[PDB]
Amino acid sequence: GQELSQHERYVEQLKQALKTRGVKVKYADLLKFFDFVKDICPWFPQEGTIDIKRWRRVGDCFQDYYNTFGPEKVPVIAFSYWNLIKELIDKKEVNPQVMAAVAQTEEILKSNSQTDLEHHHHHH
């Protein structure tokens, strides 16, 4: 959600990198969103976090299939992919939804094995 603002600035950074590849001028957010959103999130485009283990499984499936299918528009962007996914998470260490899925799913407030409410304790 709000993290969207962060995605904007980044989107601009990703475009610059590809720009140095001598590649034409295309949108990264869209090209990636549509492709990925439908890739790891084919039935749930609501969130869809960045994943290396999954994107890899679904990545090879569609990819290994598209290529083995002898395509007529064999894009080079392929080679670029995968490698970018790794270096991506790194520069993402900033504070994306990935880090949130942790603070949210595993709130620090959680007791030893109870809940954040903590019946034993009473604060107000």
List residues near ligand MYR by CB under 6 A. Answer: 1, 3-4, 7, 32, 36, 47, 49-50, 88, 96-97
CB of 42 to ligand MYR, least distance (A): 15
CB-nearer residue toward ligand MYR: 49 or 80: 49
CB of 21 to ligand MYR, least distance (A): 17
CB of 96 to ligand MYR, least distance (A): 4
CB-nearer residue toward ligand MYR: 87 or 118: 87
Phi-psi category of 95—alpha, beta or left, where left has phi over 0 and alpha has psi -120 to 50? Answer: left
CB-nearer residue toward ligand MYR: 3 or 118: 3
Residue 85 CB partners (closer than 8 Å, separation 6+): 50, 52, 55, 56
CB-nearer residue toward ligand MYR: 44 or 69: 44
CB of 117 to ligand MYR, least distance (A): 27
Locate all alpha helices (DSSP H) within the chain, ordered by sequence: 4-19, 28-32, 38-40, 53-68, 77-92, 97-105
What is the number of other CB atoms lying within 10 angstroms of the CB of residue 97? 19
Phi-psi category of 81—alpha, beta or left, where left has phi over 0 and alpha has psi -120 to 50? Answer: beta
